[PDB]
PDB file of C-alpha atoms and ligand atoms in Angstrom:
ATOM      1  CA  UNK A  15     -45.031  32.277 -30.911  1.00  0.00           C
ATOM      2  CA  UNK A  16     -46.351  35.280 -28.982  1.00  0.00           C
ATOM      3  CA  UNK A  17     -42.727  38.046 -28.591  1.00  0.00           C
ATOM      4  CA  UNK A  18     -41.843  36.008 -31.736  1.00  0.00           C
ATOM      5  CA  UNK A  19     -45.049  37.129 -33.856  1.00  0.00           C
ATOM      6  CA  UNK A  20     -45.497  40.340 -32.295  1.00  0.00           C
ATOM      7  CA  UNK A  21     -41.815  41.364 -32.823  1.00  0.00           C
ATOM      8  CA  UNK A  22     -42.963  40.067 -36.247  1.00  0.00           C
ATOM      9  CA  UNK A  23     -45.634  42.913 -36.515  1.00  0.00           C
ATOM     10  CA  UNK A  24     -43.311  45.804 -35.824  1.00  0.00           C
ATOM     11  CA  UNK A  25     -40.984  45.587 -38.708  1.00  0.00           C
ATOM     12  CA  UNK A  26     -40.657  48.836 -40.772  1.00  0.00           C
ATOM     13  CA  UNK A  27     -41.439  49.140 -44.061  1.00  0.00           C
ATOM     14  CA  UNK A  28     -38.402  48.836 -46.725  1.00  0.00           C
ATOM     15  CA  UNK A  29     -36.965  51.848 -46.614  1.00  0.00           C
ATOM     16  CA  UNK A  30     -35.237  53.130 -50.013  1.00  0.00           C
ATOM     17  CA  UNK A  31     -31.673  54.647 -50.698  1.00  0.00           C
ATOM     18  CA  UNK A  32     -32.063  56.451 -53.779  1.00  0.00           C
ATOM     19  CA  UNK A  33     -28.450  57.508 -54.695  1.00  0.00           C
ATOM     20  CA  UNK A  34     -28.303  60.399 -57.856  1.00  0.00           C
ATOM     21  CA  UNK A  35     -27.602  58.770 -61.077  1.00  0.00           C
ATOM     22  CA  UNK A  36     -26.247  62.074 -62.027  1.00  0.00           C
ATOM     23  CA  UNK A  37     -23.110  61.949 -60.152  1.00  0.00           C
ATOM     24  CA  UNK A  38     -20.362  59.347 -61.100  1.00  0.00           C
ATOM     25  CA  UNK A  39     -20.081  56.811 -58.665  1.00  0.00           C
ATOM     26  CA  UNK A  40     -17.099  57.750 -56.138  1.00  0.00           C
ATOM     27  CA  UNK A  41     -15.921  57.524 -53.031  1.00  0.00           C
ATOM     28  CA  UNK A  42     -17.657  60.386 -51.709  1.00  0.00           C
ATOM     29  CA  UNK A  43     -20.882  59.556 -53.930  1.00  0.00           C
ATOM     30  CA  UNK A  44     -20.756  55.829 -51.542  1.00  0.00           C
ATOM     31  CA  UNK A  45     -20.651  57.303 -48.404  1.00  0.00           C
ATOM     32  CA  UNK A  46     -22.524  60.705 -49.159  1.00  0.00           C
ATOM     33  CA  UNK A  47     -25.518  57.887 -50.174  1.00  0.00           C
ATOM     34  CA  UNK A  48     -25.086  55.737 -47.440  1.00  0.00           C
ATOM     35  CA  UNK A  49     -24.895  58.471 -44.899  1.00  0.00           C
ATOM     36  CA  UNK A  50     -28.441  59.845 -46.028  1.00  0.00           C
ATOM     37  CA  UNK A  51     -29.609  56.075 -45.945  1.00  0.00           C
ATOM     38  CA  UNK A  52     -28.714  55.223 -42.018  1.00  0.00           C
ATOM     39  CA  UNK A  53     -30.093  59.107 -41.357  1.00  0.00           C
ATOM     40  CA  UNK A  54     -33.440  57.401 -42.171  1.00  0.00           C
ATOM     41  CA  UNK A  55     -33.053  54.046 -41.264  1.00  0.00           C
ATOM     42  CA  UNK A  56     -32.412  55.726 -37.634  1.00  0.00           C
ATOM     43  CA  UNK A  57     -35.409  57.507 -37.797  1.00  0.00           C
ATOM     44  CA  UNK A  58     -37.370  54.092 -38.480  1.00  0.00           C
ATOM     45  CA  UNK A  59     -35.364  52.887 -35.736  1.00  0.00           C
ATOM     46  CA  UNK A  60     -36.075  54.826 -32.838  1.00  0.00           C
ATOM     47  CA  UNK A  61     -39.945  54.043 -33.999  1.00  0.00           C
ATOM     48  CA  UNK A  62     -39.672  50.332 -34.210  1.00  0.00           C
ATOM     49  CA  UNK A  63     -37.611  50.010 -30.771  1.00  0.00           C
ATOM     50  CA  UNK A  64     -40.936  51.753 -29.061  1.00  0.00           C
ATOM     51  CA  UNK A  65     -42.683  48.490 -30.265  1.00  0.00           C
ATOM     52  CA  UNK A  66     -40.483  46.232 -28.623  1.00  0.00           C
ATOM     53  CA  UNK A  67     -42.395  44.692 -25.936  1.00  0.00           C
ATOM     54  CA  UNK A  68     -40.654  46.434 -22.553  1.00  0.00           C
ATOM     55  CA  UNK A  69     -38.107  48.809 -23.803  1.00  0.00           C
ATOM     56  CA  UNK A  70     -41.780  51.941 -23.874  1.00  0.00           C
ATOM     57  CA  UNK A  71     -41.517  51.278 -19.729  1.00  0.00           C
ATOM     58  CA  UNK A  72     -37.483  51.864 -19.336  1.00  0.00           C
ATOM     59  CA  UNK A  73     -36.421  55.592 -18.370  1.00  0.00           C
ATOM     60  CA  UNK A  74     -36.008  57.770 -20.985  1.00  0.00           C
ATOM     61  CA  UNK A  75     -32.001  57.791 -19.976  1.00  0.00           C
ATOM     62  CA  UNK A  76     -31.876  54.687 -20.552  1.00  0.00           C
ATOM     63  CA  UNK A  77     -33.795  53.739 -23.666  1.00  0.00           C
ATOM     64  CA  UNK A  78     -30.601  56.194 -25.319  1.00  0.00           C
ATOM     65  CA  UNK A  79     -27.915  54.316 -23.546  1.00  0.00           C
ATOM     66  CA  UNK A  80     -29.552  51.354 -25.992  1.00  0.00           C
ATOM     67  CA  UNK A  81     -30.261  53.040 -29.283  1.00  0.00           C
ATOM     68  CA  UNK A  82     -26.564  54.684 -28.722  1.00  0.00           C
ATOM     69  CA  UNK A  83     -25.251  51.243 -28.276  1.00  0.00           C
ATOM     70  CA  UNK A  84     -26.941  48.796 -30.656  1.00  0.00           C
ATOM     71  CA  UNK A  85     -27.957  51.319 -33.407  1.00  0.00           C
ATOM     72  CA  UNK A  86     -24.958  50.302 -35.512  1.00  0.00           C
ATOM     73  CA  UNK A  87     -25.416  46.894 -34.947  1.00  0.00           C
ATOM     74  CA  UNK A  88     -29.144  47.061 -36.112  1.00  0.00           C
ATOM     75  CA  UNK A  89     -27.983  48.797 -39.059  1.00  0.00           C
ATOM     76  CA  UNK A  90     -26.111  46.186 -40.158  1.00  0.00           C
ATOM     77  CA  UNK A  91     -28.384  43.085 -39.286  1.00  0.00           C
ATOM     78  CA  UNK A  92     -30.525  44.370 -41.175  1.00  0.00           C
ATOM     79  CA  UNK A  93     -28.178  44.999 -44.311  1.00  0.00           C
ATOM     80  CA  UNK A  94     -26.905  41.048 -43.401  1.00  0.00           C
ATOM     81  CA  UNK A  95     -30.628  40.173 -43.625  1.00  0.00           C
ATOM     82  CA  UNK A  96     -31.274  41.966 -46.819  1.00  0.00           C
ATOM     83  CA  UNK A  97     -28.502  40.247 -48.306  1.00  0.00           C
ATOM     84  CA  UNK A  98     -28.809  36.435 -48.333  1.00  0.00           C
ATOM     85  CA  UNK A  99     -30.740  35.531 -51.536  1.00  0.00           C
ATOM     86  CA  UNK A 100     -27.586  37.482 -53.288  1.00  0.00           C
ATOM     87  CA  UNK A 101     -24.488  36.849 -53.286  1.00  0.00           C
ATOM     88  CA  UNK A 102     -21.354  38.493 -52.074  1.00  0.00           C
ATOM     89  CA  UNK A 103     -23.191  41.788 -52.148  1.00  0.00           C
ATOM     90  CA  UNK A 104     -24.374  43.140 -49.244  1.00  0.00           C
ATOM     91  CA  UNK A 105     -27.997  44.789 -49.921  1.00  0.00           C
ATOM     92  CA  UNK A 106     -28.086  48.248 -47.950  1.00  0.00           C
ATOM     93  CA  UNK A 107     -31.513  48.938 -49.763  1.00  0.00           C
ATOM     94  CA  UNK A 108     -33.454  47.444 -52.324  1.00  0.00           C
ATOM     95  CA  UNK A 109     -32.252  50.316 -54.961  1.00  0.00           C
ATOM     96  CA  UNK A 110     -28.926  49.827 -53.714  1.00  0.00           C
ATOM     97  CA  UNK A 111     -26.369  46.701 -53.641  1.00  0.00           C
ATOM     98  CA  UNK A 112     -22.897  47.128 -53.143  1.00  0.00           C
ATOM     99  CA  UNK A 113     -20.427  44.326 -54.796  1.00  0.00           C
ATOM    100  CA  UNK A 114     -16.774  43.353 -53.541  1.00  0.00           C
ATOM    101  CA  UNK A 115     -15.002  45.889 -56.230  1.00  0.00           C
ATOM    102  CA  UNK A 116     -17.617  48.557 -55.043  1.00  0.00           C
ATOM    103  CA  UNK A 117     -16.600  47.726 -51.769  1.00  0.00           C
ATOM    104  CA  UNK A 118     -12.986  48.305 -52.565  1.00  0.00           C
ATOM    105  CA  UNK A 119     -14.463  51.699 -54.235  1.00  0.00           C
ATOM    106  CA  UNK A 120     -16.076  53.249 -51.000  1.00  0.00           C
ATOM    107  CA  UNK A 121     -13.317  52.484 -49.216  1.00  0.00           C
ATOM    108  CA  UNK A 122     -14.883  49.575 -46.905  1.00  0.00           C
ATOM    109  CA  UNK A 123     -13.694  46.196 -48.161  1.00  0.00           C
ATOM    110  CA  UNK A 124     -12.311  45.277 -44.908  1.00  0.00           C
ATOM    111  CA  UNK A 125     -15.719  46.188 -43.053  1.00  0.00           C
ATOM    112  CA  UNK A 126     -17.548  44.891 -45.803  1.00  0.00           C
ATOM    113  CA  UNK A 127     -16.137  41.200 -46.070  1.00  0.00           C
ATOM    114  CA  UNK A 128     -16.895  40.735 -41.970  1.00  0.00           C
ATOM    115  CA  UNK A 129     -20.436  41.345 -42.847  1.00  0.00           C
ATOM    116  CA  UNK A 130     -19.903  39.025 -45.698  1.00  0.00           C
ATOM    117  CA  UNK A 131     -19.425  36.360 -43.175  1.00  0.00           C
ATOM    118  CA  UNK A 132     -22.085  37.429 -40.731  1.00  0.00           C
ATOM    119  CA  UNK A 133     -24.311  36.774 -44.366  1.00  0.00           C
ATOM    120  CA  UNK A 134     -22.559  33.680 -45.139  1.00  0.00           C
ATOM    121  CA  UNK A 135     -23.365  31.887 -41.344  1.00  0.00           C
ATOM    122  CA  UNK A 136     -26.748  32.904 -41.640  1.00  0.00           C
ATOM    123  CA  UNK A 137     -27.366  31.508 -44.779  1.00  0.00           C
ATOM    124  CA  UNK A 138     -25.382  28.670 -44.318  1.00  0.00           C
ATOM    125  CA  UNK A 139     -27.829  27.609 -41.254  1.00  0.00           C
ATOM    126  CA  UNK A 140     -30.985  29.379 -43.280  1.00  0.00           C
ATOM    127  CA  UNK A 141     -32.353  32.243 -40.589  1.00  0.00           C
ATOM    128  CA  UNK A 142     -35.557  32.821 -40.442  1.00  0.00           C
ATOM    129  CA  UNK A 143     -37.170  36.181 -40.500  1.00  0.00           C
ATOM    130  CA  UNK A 144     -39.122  34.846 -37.238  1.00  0.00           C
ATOM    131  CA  UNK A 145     -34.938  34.467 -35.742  1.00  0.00           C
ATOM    132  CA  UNK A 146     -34.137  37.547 -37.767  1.00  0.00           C
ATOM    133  CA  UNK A 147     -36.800  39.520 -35.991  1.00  0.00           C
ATOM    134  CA  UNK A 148     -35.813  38.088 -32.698  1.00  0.00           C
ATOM    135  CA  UNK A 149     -32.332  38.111 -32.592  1.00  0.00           C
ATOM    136  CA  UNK A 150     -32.217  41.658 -33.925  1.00  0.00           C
ATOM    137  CA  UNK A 151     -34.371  42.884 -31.239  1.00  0.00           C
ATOM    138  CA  UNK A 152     -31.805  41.013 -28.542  1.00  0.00           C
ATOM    139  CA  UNK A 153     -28.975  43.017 -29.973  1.00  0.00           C
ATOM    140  CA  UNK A 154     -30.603  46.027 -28.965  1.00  0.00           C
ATOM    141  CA  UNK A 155     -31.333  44.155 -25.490  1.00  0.00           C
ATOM    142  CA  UNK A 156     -27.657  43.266 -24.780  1.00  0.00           C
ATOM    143  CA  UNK A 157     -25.792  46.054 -26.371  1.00  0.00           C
ATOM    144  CA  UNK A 158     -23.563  46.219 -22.910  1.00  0.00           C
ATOM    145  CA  UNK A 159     -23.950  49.842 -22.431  1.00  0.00           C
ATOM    146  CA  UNK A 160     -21.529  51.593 -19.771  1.00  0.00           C
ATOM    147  CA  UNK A 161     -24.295  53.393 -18.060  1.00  0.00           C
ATOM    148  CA  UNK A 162     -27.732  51.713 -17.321  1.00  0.00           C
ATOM    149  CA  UNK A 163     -30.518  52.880 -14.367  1.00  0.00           C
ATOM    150  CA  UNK A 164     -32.067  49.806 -13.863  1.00  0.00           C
ATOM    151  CA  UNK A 165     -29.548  47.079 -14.462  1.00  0.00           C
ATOM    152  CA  UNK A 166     -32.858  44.656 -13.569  1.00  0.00           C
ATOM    153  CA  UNK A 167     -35.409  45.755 -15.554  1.00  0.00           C
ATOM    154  CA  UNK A 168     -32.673  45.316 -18.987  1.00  0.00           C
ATOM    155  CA  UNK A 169     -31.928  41.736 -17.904  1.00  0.00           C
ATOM    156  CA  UNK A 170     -35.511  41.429 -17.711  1.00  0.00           C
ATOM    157  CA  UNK A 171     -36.168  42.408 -20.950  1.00  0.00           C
ATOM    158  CA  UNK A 172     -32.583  40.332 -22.023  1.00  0.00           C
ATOM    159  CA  UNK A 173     -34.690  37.055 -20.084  1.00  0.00           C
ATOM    160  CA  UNK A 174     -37.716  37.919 -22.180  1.00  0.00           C
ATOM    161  CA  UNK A 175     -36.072  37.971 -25.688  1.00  0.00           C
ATOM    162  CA  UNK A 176     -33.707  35.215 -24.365  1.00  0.00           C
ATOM    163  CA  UNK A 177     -37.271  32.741 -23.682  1.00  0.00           C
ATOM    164  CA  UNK A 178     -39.241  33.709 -26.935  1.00  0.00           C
ATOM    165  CA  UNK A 179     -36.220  32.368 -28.674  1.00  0.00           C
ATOM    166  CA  UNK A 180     -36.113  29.241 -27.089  1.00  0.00           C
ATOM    167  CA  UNK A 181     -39.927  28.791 -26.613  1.00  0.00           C
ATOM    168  CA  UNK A 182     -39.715  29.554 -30.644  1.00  0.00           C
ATOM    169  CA  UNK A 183     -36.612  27.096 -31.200  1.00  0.00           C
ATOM    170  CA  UNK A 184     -37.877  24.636 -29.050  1.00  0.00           C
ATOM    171  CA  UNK A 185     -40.435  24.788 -31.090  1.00  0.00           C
ATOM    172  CA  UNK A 186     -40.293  25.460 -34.529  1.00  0.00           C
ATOM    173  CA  UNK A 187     -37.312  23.637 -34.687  1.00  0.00           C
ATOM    174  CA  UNK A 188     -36.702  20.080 -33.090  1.00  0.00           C
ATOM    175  CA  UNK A 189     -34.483  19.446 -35.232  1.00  0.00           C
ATOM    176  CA  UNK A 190     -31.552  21.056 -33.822  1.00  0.00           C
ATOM    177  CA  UNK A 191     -31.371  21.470 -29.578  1.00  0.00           C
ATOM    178  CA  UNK A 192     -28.390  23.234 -29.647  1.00  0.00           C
ATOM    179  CA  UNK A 193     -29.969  25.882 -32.000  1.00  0.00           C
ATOM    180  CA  UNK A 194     -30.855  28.978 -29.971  1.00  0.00           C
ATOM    181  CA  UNK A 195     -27.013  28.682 -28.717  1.00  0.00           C
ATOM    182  CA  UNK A 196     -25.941  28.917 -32.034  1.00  0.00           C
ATOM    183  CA  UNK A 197     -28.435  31.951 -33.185  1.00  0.00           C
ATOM    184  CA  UNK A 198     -26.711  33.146 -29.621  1.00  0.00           C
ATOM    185  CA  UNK A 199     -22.994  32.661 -30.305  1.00  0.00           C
ATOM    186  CA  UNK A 200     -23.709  34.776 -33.538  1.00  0.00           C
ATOM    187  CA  UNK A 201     -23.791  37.814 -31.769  1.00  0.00           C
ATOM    188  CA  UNK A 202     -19.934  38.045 -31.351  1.00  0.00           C
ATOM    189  CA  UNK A 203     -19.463  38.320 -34.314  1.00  0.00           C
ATOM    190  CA  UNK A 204     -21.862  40.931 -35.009  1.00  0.00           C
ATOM    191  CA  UNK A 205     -20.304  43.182 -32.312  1.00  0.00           C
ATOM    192  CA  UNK A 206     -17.438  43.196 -33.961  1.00  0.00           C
ATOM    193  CA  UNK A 207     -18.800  44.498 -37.278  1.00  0.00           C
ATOM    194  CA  UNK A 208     -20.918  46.616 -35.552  1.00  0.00           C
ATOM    195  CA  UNK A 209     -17.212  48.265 -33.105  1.00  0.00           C
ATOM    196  CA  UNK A 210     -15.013  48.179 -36.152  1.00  0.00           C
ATOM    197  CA  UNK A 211     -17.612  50.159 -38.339  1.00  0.00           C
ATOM    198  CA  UNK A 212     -18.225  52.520 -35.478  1.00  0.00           C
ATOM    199  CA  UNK A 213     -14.509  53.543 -35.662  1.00  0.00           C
ATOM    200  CA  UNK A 214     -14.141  53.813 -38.776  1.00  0.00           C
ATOM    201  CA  UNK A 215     -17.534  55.375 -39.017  1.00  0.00           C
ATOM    202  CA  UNK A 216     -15.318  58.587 -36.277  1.00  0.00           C
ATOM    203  CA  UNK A 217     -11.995  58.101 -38.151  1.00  0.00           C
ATOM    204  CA  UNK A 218     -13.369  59.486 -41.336  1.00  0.00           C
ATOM    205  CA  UNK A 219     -15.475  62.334 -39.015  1.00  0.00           C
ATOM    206  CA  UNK A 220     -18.930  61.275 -40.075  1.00  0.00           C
ATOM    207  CA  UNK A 221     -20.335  61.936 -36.466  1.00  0.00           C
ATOM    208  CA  UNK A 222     -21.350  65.582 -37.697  1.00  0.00           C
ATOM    209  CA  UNK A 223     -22.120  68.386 -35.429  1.00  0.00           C
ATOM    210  CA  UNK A 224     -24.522  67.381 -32.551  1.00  0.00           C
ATOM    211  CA  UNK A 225     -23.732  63.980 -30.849  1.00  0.00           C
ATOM    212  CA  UNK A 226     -25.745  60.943 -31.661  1.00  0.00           C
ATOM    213  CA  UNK A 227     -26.728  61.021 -28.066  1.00  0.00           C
ATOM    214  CA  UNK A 228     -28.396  64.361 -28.786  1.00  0.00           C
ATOM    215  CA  UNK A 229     -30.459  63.261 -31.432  1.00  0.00           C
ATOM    216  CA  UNK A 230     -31.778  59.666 -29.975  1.00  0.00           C
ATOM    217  CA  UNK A 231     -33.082  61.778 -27.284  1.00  0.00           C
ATOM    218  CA  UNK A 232     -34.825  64.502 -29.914  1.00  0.00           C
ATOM    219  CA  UNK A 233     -36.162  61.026 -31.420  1.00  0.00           C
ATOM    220  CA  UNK A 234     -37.336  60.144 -28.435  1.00  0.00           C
ATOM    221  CA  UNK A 235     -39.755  62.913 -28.139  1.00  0.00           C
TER     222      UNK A 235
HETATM  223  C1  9S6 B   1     -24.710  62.860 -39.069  1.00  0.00           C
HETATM  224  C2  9S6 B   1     -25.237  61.556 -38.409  1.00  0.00           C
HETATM  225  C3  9S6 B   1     -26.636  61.856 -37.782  1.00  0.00           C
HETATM  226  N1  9S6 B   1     -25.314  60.527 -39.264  1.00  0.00           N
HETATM  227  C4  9S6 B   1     -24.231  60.422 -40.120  1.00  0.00           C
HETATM  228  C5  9S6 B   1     -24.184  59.137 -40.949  1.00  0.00           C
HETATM  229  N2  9S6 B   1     -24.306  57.931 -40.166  1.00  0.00           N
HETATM  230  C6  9S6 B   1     -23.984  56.620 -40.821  1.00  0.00           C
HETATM  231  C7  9S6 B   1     -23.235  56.593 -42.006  1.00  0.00           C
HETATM  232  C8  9S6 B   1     -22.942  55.348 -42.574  1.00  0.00           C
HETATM  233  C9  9S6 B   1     -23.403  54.163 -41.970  1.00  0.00           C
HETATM  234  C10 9S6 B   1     -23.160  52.787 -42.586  1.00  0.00           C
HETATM  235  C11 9S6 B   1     -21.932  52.355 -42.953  1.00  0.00           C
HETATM  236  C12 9S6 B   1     -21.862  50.899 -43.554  1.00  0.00           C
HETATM  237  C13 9S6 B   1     -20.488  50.310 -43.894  1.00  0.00           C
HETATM  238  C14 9S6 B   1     -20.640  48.774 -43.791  1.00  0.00           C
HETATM  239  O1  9S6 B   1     -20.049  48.192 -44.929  1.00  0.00           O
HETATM  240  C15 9S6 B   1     -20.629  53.211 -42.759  1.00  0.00           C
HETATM  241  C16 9S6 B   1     -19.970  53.314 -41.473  1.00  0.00           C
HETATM  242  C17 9S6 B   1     -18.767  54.096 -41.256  1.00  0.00           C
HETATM  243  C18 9S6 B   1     -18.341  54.716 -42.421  1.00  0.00           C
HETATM  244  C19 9S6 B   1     -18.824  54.729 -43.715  1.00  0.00           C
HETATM  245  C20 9S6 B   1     -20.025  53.927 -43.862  1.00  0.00           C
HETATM  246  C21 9S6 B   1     -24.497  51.924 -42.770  1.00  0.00           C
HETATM  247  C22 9S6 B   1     -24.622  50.642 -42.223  1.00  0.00           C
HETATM  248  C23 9S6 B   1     -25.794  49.874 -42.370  1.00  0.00           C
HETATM  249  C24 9S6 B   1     -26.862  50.399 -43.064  1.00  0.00           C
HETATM  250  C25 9S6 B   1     -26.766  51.677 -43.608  1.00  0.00           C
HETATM  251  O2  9S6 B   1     -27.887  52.158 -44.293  1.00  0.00           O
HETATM  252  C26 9S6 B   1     -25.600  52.449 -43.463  1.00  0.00           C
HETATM  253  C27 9S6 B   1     -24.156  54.199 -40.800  1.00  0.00           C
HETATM  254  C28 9S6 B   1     -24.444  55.442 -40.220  1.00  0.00           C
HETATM  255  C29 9S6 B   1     -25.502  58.029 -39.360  1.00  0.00           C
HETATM  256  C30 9S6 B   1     -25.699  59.353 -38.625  1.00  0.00           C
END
């Protein structure tokens, strides 16, 4: 239970969206809110991948070519995790919960109904924060960036994540052998999420001004 519970100890604290209740609800309210939210979130981001055992030791070139390639994807297991005890709402903060017709409002129903089903396997096999913790960390670890210094030492850390969650499944959970592949064969679909949201996330020029890999590097510092 050791990666497990000290993965455990590095979550953030809830971080809150806050959207005006002085402007009518729009399009441009819903993505004007959520754009301020993940602006944050990243921040908290860039802190808690520090914590994850390995990824302080990487180059600094590297530990971008991560954060630029999972950051998405940890966005969004983290608004899947949020969401199970509701339903078919996906919970981007505690002050904020966005429904199928809001969906439709924002102008992400499509996105929003893949994550739907990334909330709906989860719950329908009943994740654990203990899996949460650990498979959103191994996201960050397998992100398949184009560019990596030491292709070793990230399959090392990829191994390391990859043991703690069988030495945990194994474990915790005799129940089920075939349980870590299934946790595993998740994944997919959260790449997909994650690569249809980052083109939409372009497509509607929400990138700004400096490039996200400018700013992960900033972070960094
Ligand atoms: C200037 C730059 C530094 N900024 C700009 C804003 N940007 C951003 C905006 C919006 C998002 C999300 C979404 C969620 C939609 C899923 O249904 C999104 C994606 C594409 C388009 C419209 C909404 C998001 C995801 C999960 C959690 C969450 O809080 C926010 C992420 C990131 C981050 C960086």
């Amino acid at each position: 239970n050791k990666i497990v519970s000290h993965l455990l100890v590095a979550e953030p604290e809830k971080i809150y969206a806050m959207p005006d209740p002085t402007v009518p609800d729009s399009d441009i309210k819903a993505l004007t809110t959520l754009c301020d939210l993940a602006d944050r979130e990243l921040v908290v981001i860039i802190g808690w991948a520090k914590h994850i055992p390995g990824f302080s030791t990487l180059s600094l070139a590297d530990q971008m070519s991560l954060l630029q390639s999972a950051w998405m994807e940890i966005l969004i297991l983290g608004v899947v995790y949020r969401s199970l005890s509701f339903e078919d709402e996906l919970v981007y903060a505690d002050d904020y919960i966005m429904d199928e017709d809001q969906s439709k409002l924002a102008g992400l129903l499509d996105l929003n109904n893949a994550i739907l089903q990334l909330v709906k396997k989860y719950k329908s096999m009943k994740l654990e924060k203990e899996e949460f913790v650990t498979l959103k960390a191994i996201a960050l670890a397998n992100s398949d960036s184009m560019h990596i210094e030491d292709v070793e030492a990230v399959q090392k850390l990829q191994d390391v994540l990859h043991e703690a969650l069988q030495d945990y499944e194994a474990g915790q959970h005799m129940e089920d052998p075939r349980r870590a592949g299934k946790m595993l064969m998740t994944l997919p679909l959260l790449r997909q999420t994650s690569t249809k949201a980052v083109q939409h996330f372009y497509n509607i020029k929400l990138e700004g001004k400096v490039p996200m890999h400018k700013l992960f590097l900033e972070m960094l510092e």
